[PDB]
Amino acid sequence: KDDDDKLHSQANLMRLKSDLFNRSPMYPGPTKDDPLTVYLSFSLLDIVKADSSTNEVDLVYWEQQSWKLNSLMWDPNEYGNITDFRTSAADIWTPDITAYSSTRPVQVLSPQNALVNSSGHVQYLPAQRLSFMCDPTGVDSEEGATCAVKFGSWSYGGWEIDLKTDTDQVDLSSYYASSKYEILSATQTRSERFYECCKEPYPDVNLVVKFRER
Amino acid sequence: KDDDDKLHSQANLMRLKSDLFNRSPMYPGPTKDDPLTVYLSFSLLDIVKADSSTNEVDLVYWEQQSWKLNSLMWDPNEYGNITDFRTSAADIWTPDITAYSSTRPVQVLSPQNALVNSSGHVQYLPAQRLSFMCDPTGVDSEEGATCAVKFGSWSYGGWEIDLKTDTDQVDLSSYYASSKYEILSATQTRSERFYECCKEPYPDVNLVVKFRERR
Amino acid sequence: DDDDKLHSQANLMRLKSDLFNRSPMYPGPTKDDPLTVYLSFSLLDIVKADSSTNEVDLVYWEQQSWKLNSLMWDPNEYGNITDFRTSAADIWTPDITAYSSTRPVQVLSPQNALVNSSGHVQYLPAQRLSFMCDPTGVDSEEGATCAVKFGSWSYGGWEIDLKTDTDQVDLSSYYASSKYEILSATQTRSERFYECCKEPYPDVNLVVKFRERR
Amino acid sequence: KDDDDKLHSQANLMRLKSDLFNRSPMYPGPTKDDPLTVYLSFSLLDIVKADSSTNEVDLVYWEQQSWKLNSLMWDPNEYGNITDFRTSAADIWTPDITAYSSTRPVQVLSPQNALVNSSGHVQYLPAQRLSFMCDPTGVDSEEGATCAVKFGSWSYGGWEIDLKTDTDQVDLSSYYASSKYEILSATQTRSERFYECCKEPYPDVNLVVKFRERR
Amino acid sequence: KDDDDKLHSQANLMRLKSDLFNRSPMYPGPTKDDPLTVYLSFSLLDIVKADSSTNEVDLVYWEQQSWKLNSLMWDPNEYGNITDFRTSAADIWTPDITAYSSTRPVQVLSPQNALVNSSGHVQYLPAQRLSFMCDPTGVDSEEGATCAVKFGSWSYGGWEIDLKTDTDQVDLSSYYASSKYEILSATQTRSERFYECCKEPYPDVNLVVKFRERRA
Ligand SMILES: CCN1C[C@]2(COC(=O)c3ccccc3N3C(=O)C[C@H](C)C3=O)CC[C@H](OC)[C@@]34[C@@H]5C[C@H]6[C@H](OC)[C@@H]5[C@](O)(C[C@@H]6OC)[C@@](O)([C@@H](OC)[C@H]23)[C@@H]14
Ligand SMILES: CCN1C[C@]2(COC(=O)c3ccccc3N3C(=O)C[C@H](C)C3=O)CC[C@H](OC)[C@@]34[C@@H]5C[C@H]6[C@H](OC)[C@@H]5[C@](O)(C[C@@H]6OC)[C@@](O)([C@@H](OC)[C@H]23)[C@@H]14
Ligand SMILES: CCN1C[C@]2(COC(=O)c3ccccc3N3C(=O)C[C@H](C)C3=O)CC[C@H](OC)[C@@]34[C@@H]5C[C@H]6[C@H](OC)[C@@H]5[C@](O)(C[C@@H]6OC)[C@@](O)([C@@H](OC)[C@H]23)[C@@H]14
Ligand SMILES: CCN1C[C@]2(COC(=O)c3ccccc3N3C(=O)C[C@H](C)C3=O)CC[C@H](OC)[C@@]34[C@@H]5C[C@H]6[C@H](OC)[C@@H]5[C@](O)(C[C@@H]6OC)[C@@](O)([C@@H](OC)[C@H]23)[C@@H]14
Ligand SMILES: CCN1C[C@]2(COC(=O)c3ccccc3N3C(=O)C[C@H](C)C3=O)CC[C@H](OC)[C@@]34[C@@H]5C[C@H]6[C@H](OC)[C@@H]5[C@](O)(C[C@@H]6OC)[C@@](O)([C@@H](OC)[C@H]23)[C@@H]14
């Protein structure tokens, strides 16, 4: 009936995945000769705690990571008109973006699952709680306090992975209104850094947040 | 013989799980062409802590999840008139339902097991302790504090996974009599979210709790 | 005697291979193959009673024991081995939970079971459980009282039956210098029934009367 | 060259590790017909905290375990004259020795790796942080306070696993000079019990620590 | 075309990793007959907390580790002129190197991935947070406190793994300027210790740190 169509779609999905993760090897990761661009964007849910005894602030946020792999492309016509699929992030290569000034291991607040689609684009959007080095002086004033945290590849330079922000403005829309702290401003900026060691540029995305007690 | 029956019974179950799990590849997940409906529900047990300095609350509750897969269906006459069986939750596909509001990784307080039966209905009922953003303010008065947390699939829209609920009434019959906090109202409310960007519905269940200090 | 030692080990490996490799792991109890599990508690310490969260922390040993026909053997075929120790991971274990725990149960002991030729299993693991309790009275003479129910999570009385050896919780191992004194501890079986759905459910109720020491 | 010496070096070890682990099953454990002697010795590094509110003390120490297995023996002449090698603690069998009074799961501060040598002796030294039941009362005085914690096999009796101890003196040579607590005495004593149940003796090693606030 | 080079790139590196890892057995570890030198280097980041009740301190740093294995070499010519690659550190051998005075299990703040190059050199650099035994006394003083922590192999002696440092100067350039505590000095120094038990040396690197409550 109509639900035989349900079967073919299940069968078609299995088949696509098989073609992708079994018939073909897992991605070795970007190389100088296969540079990759990773798009990074932040949405800030809560500032849970600002600790002036340890100088550590706790953020809860979503981090949108996306990038494209030719290895992940397919023609939806051969696979029953499937233009995408959800999958565990264990089954696909994921980038090593990390907070550079984490003071604690990051806690993952969301299922770790990615969306892949026919163009070979991947959307990974992990929700997480980060503790990072922040001195909150003046959080209780009106001018407020400001803390920065940088994100980027741990093991890869600009010639292998390239960071870009699609928007310079941090997304404040889902932030918690009844949170102890209120956001004056938050901005995600991209930078490039150099070392005498090597001529390769090293990108980071610097997250700057201004906030006060509420 | 009584023993011979116990024997056949077992073998039957092994064969049955074998047919589903070994012989067919585990279910790939829902698609638009093959949507899934998940029924949620909540049973309240304890509000353990309300933290005024961080604005977080600790809740201990049962979250009931149900769904149906044709893949899990079988004929009881085929396998010993077995109408249902228990299984480890890692043996079956489970839905990526998550509280969108959590401040700490959820902790599981019970075995992870699911009931499954002949028509392919899965029943999963994890006990959990959750910390989420809430404002305790006013919990020391008569009106109490009201807090809320949204649950829904993290990776899936309403055209793949659709959220539903038995009732709008949270189950308090199991709530801890001696808890530091007493519960005034508790509700589970469904809604669908729509974005500028996309035509697809994004459902959630909204758990709303009204609570105050016990004395 | 060396050879005798080598033959004892060969025998044990062979007995083990027959159960966990020759035949596939027990699917668990059912209506037509029900199981009885005996529970007995031994109370070690009450480490903390928190008045602010209404939580109590306990250290205790939980004796679980049961019979499985698939675990039987005739010692003569196997070098007169009448019992062995095994990793609890290797055998089906009943799913018994504290119903009113407020944290994940912490395991203090190696998880290892005793099996013998009649097919009886004995598993005792030391745990720290924190659960829902009202401490008030703990600073009085009469003392505070708390209770926790233990039973199966996903099985009913028709599949798993609960039973106790005695109604007397064992205090013989209870820490003398503990912050809290144990006035009484009882362990009582009860069956939960419904008008609605016809299958009994069991549980064992650990009730503890305790006060601050003087 | 001096390279060839290194290649045989590696190959003989890979070879030796394979003959023990791959071509032979893992040791089933001690039995009444095949008993094993375990040596337990302690070295104290720190007493981190005494908590007078819960009556628990937190201790950092090395626990040295030694035993000899016939199935770990080899002739050095036959592999490269290799008399010993380091392996992951998970590759071999380990005795299950536990603090009987621990109030939290133990935390390992060190890699888990053992040393094995040609006569079948194994030496395993995990650095651990343990919390055990102790009443700190008197730790602010001159006599200090005294606690004890028994270690032993959880699942095996004296006819299967035989506990012995190196010294009655717990090694203080590595203890931390600047600790909030000074150690007056630390001793490790072997002991055995009997039960109404059985004739088989149960050994434990009793670690008794006397300490007081340094100042 | 342009994308052809891309493929050969991907294929080449999958082939290289296959020859080293799936074709050859993971390295058995150093031996007295095949010893190894690991270099340690420290870059100090934050002293997060100093606990004067328990005398433990919490520290954040990067620890650079490098060694060389002949078994990890290749000719870049046979292999598309790949001169190095990134990999998970679970796929290679890593030295067991522990802070000896740790009071709580080390936490890792970064991805455990390591870089390997055609000469055979391996370079591994985790961020960690360490609780270790230190008495913060006179951290109030303008003169500060002083603490040290030892690092070495847990299971290996000096004839199997020899421990070295590139500079006796700890790298402070990445230190957090707004930290509760300021760094007066940090040194990293190689020690060697003999026991009666054996005539074999046991190396360690000592990290010595003098800090005080920051006043800016
Ligand atoms: C390998 C670990 N990795 C972490 C680093 C760390 O980067 C940062 O922390 C950082 C980056 C930009 C701006 C500020 C940064 N920063 C600080 O330095 C202080 C605080 C932690 C912070 O936010 C990421 C980028 C790069 O790795 C691809 C590094 C650089 C690559 C290259 C550079 O050495 C000159 C540098 C590394 O030192 C090691 C490498 O040597 C092979 C590295 O550890 C980081 O140094 C900042 C830096 C490398
Ligand atoms: C994959 C992660 N996922 C988590 C999200 C997040 O859900 C929520 O946060 C949320 C949902 C319903 C009601 C309230 C929610 N909420 C908030 O938004 C903040 C407030 C405190 C709260 O609890 C749910 C499921 C959906 O994807 C199935 C999302 C939407 C799908 C679609 C939507 O774009 C607007 C939106 C996503 O941005 C990603 C996609 O962009 C193509 C997503 O990350 C979440 O946005 C909130 C939203 C997607
Ligand atoms: C898998 C979840 N499971 C946990 C439950 C939980 O039971 C209890 O918590 C409980 C049982 C007896 C007495 C008191 C109990 N109790 C509470 O209810 C909380 C309070 C702190 C406490 O101790 C165990 C037994 C049974 O499952 C075998 C349950 C019952 C079986 C049946 C019953 O519903 C009709 C009931 C369930 O609601 C769901 C089931 O529907 C398939 C269940 O979730 C638990 O409800 C008590 C109850 C089921
Ligand atoms: C299997 C778990 N195991 C832990 C036990 C418990 O050991 C102790 O805690 C202990 C031992 C000696 C002296 C004092 C002990 N002790 C206390 O019991 C109080 C105090 C907190 C403490 O540390 C040690 C090992 C032994 O079997 C290896 C036990 C005994 C073997 C035998 C004994 O039955 C009485 C007893 C067990 O009950 C189980 C067995 O059933 C036949 C056992 O659980 C422990 O009983 C305390 C006792 C067994
Ligand atoms: C595998 C355990 N191992 C850890 C050890 C532990 O290291 C230290 O604690 C340590 C080492 C050098 C200098 C100071 C150390 N130390 C202290 O001991 C106290 C102070 C806080 C500190 O950091 C590392 C080096 C060596 O193994 C490579 C050890 C020594 C080799 C030899 C020595 O015994 C005579 C000594 C060991 O006792 C056991 C060994 O016998 C197999 C060992 O456990 C450690 O003893 C310190 C010591 C061995």
Ligand SMILES: *[C@@H]1O[C@H](CO)[C@@H](O[C@@H]2O[C@H](CO)[C@@H](O)[C@H](O)[C@H]2NC(C)=O)[C@H](O)[C@H]1NC(C)=O
């Ligand atoms: C699959 O995913 C990628 C990434 O979202 C899609 O590429 C984007 O598609 C939108 C559609 O308008 C464009 O606006 C974007 O410019 C495209 N790239 C980016 C990063 O902006 C792609 O179209 C999707 N394809 C399918 C079959 O669904």
Ligand SMILES: *[C@@H]1O[C@H](CO)[C@@H](O[C@@H]2O[C@H](CO)[C@@H](O)[C@H](O)[C@H]2NC(C)=O)[C@H](O)[C@H]1NC(C)=O
């Ligand atoms: C197997 O599982 C399904 C799912 O619960 C059962 O279908 C339910 O049956 C109950 C009892 O009559 C009804 O109240 C519900 O309306 C049904 N579904 C739902 C969504 O609640 C089915 O009855 C079970 N089969 C057996 C063993 O009787």
Ligand SMILES: *[C@@H]1O[C@H](CO)[C@@H](O[C@@H]2O[C@H](CO)[C@@H](O)[C@H](O)[C@H]2NC(C)=O)[C@H](O)[C@H]1NC(C)=O
């Ligand atoms: C295996 O252990 C069980 C106990 O766990 C033994 O069963 C005991 O049998 C005796 C004699 O009938 C009873 O007195 C005990 O009550 C039983 N145990 C308990 C506490 O229920 C069984 O005998 C052992 N197997 C063999 C044959 O040695």
Ligand SMILES: *[C@@H]1O[C@H](CO)[C@@H](O)[C@H](O)[C@H]1NC(C)=O
């Ligand atoms: C199923 O149940 C019927 C009784 O209702 C029984 O007679 C029949 O034998 C059972 N089927 C099998 C295969 O045992």
Ligand SMILES: *[C@@H]1O[C@H](CO)[C@@H](O)[C@H](O)[C@H]1NC(C)=O
């Ligand atoms: C030990 O074995 C090695 C390698 O075969 C050999 O070269 C060496 O001579 C042996 N030692 C002795 C004393 O024979």
Ligand SMILES: *[C@@H]1O[C@H](CO)[C@@H](O)[C@H](O)[C@H]1NC(C)=O
């Ligand atoms: C192996 O270690 C044991 C325990 O110390 C010892 O008796 C023996 O001398 C050692 N033998 C070798 C080959 O090193």
Ligand SMILES: *[C@@H]1O[C@H](CO)[C@@H](O)[C@H](O)[C@H]1NC(C)=O
């Ligand atoms: C690899 O490592 C060594 C040590 O850093 C370095 O000197 C050598 O140049 C590197 N090989 C290259 C350049 O690819």
Ligand SMILES: [Mg+2]
């Ligand atoms: Mg028959």
Ligand SMILES: [Mg+2]
């Ligand atoms: Mg013989």
Ligand SMILES: [Mg+2]
């Ligand atoms: Mg040769």
Ligand SMILES: [Mg+2]
């Ligand atoms: Mg070509």
